Design brief:
Helix content of chain B: 25-40%
Radius of gyration of chain D: 21 Å
Subunit structure (chain C): Core subunit of respiratory chain NADH dehydrogenase (Complex I) which is composed of 45 different subunits.
Largest sheet of chain D: none
CATH architecture of chain D: Up-down Bundle
Chains: A mainly alpha (about 90), B mainly alpha (about 150), C mainly alpha (about 100), D mainly alpha (about 170), E mainly alpha (about 60), F mainly alpha (about 300), G mainly alpha (about 80), H mainly alpha (about 60)
Helix content of chain D: 55-70%
Order of helices and strands of chain B: HHEHEHEH
Keywords (chain C): Electron transport, Formylation, Membrane, Mitochondrion, Mitochondrion inner membrane, NAD, Respiratory chain, Translocase, Transmembrane, Transmembrane helix, Transport, Ubiquinone
CATH class of chain D: Mainly Alpha
Strand content of chain B: 5-15%
Number of domains of chain D: 1
Oligomer: part of a larger assembly
Protein name (chain C): NADH-ubiquinone oxidoreductase chain 4L
Pfam families (chain C): Oxidored_q2
Family (chain C): Belongs to the complex I subunit 4L family.
Radius of gyration of chain B: 16 Å
Bound molecules: NADP nicotinamide-adenine-dinucleotide phosphate, iron/sulfur cluster
Chain lengths: ~90, ~150, ~100, ~170, ~60, ~300, ~80, ~60
Amino acid sequence: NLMLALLTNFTLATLLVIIAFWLPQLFSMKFFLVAITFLLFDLEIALLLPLPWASQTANLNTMLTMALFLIILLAVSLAYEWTQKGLE
Amino acid sequence: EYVVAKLDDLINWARRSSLWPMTFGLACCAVEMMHMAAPRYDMDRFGVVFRASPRQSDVMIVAGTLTNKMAPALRKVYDQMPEPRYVVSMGSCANGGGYYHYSYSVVRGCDRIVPVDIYVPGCPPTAEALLYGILQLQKKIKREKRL
Amino acid sequence: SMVYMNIMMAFTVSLVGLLMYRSHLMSSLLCLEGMMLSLFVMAALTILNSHFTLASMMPIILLVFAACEAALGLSLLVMVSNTYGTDYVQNLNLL
Amino acid sequence: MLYIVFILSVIFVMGFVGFSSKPSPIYGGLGLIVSGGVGCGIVLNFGGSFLGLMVFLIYLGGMMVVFGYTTAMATEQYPEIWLSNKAVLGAFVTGLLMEFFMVYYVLKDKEVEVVFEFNGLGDWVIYDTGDSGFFSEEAMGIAALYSYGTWLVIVTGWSLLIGVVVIMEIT
Amino acid sequence: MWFEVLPGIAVMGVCLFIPGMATARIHRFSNGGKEKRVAHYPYQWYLMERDRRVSGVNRSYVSK
Amino acid sequence: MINILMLIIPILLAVAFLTLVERKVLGYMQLRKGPNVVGPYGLLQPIADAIKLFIKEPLRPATSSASMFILAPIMALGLALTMWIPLPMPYPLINMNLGVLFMLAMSSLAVYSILWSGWASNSKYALIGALRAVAQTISYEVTLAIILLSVLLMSGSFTLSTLITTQEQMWLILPAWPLAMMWFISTLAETNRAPFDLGPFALFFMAEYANIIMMNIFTAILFLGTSHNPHMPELYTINFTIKSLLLTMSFLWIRASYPRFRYDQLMHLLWKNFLPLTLALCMWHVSLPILTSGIP
Amino acid sequence: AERVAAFLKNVWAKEPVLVASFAIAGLAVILPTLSPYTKYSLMINXXXXXXXXXXXXXXXXXXXXXXXXXXXXXXXXXXX
Amino acid sequence: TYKYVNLREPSMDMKSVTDRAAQTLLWTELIRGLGMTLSYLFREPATINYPFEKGPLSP
Ligand SMILES: NC(=O)c1ccc[n+]([C@@H]2O[C@H](COP(=O)([O-])OP(=O)(O)OC[C@H]3O[C@@H](n4cnc5c(N)ncnc54)[C@H](OP(=O)(O)O)[C@@H]3O)[C@@H](O)[C@H]2O)c1
Ligand code: SF4
């Protein structure tokens, strides 16, 4: 069971907190541009995720031109990051 | 009855095993405190860890001279420390102003700011003599909380 | 049928959440995520129970575009906090 | 024991109540972790190995993490208790009672609904799927492919080029 | 020297040695032949279901 | 189901007994003696740190905002321990339908552990440094997904059990020569304190050092293997532990030998320099199964 | 040369990692078109069946026999 | 007296440029820096435990 496996880890993690809790008795907007680019790149990663699991039944010649195409534009988005990104 | 007396020593053994000191670079004494890291005379991972940190550390070594400018500064560090706290006044300046003393700026005794448990008398406090300060601290922890 | 009855009710709560505003502006973009989350469950179950194979890629594409509005509209939120002090629906100048 | 998905759907709505109500972006932000993580179980139970974990990767480990920045960038106001505030507790109690009243009607099978569709029971009929496929099984088992949908790949790549260029120009 | 370092490595050659062996040796007590079947896709899932139907009653994996 | 407890208790001991390795092996690098007084070779110290911090050490919170601060260590320890479940090993506990997707997911959610700690403190003084620590982890997770896919596209599906079978004669270090160099650096971003560094505070140590072993094991699956042997589980168990231990030495090697790269120039190593390199190798790894037949 | 020889050694000196970003990614497009090996990989991808093969009714058919091993249809046996 | 700290362009053409680029493309000198601590690990440490051993002194 996956449900039994996950819940056992969290319940033991909660118990460790109580041990320390119960027993003893006596600005800058330049960071934002980095965070946004993380999200926009990971969505291109999300489109490029199926590649090892997808390419099994589909035609290779039709895929080859389209598979590289996403990575090329992923570099063009980084090419726009070279024309003055900032001090970061 | 017998289990009560033996379990108390086990908690005291935990502090006898490892003690994390504060790295105060406020002295010439602090260079001798860096000789505790120097391999020839070591308490490093024998008990001492040089990670320090203002909150996680159990021990704080007041290294040498303290001025009236640092008198409110060192006091707020002591409040951030956990309840099992031991203060070592390593150096003659820390004991009661080795030099200066009668001077306007230097605070006499350190105990006027922060209470001291272990005193180390040496100006250039030789690493050999500095090894006593930690070993005596481990020996001084004998009995805590009877009832 | 039975499972769809609860998530459609969950969709209406997220719909009202978009249409409701009290001081804070951040709730709307949080509700936009929830609306797309509720649509994601509804889309998946229809293709999973009634098999399609080809159409199972469509919610994966929907997953990508859900984040596009929840980032490019989310970027505009920070621009409000650059012009004004903090983000407020109460703080608007246009008539 | 009898139901698997139906219990998770109640917790899904339970997390969503803090959106119609206004418990600040801190506690309101916490709702998407609760509703999202449980919301994966609703997707996963009928199938979808890839698509079920995409919520964890993007919606939970990407979307709301960027929203974690913006809460500190704009309107932080030091996080407050969501019980002392007026009308917030009123919106929360009315939000749950719209769904929890329907939960009582699930017993004795049939429940009253605003929509024309009936709910009935549907426990074994909840999945409504046979074995059918075996090798390379499930419609969501091969969910995404670059073939056939070639046009969709170009526009998605185009839209993600816009985002990087535009947001840089605003600031 | 290394004679001080090696007991720190040898204790890691016991604690990290557990999860590998405990997952493998449990298949002797749970299953008949020290093997657990992997699901992957409905093809292998259906074979697990019919094996229990082919005179096994409670057992999922059983020979003949 | 007893094996779950046989993958938490010996694992918590492995994080505990790291304190020996993390300052004795690091000690001989710096020509200093580590643990010696406490035990015969200092074996009593790792368990002595637990008695010090858990029971006797009290709490002094800054504000304690109802649910938070006493919820962040649960997310820290919980996500670090759940990462052990999908691990292939000789035999995995409850093998997932897809392996590596679960591995990348729980690591991306492990970013929250350092996020909620920044929200725990009421002061503005701490949160600016806290967001900077998020930036160290969030940025490297972009590349971490790319370098993973290039290894997968060479051979095998997402399942971690298939990754052992594909390494039968030769290791994956040789075909993925520049990609193996990346996993030495990219893993150190997740609070390892080697290229960049930022009661319940003690619980974060038990979670952060747990991820260090986790990245050591995960590198020894994607790149190392040597042999499988299904008939003999004895030969695999010993040989896997030695390979993982050698990578643990290299993790402590960077911590002692090399200074911090600066936060600004961490975004010059990555993004400016690494992201054009990783994608160019990703472009190369798309063509490889097409140029020569290599499909699982 | 004005751009071939001049803008090569300067690229290796100033920003040397950018040379690899254009060379490796560039050759990744050139190689799968010119090299005669890509045509073999496409055949094995189509030959490996995902689902069960369908049977057709026999009414005047060539290169089609029984399920037993016989010279019929294509049947891939490329490289061992 | 003068000693000079500046190298004044170590790379000139072709052969001298590539090896200066190789150390920045991959690492090399970091792996060479790794080897410095590697041999330093094997050699015996000079450590004195105080309750049993004693450090050097003078008359
Ligand atoms: N605000 C108020 O509560 C209030 C109001 C009106 C008047 N007062 C007066 O002001 C005084 C306040 O004192 P307090 O309550 O602050 O003192 P306290 O905190 O109880 O401290 C007294 C200390 O003396 C020790 N002690 C006392 N009797 C002992 C015994 N028989 N055996 C061993 N150890 C003993 C205790 O040590 P151990 O803990 O180790 O045993 C304790 O640490 C009271 O005496 C009261 O008459 C107080
Ligand atoms: S006691 Fe001596 S060595 Fe120490 S701070 Fe004072 S003058 Fe310096």
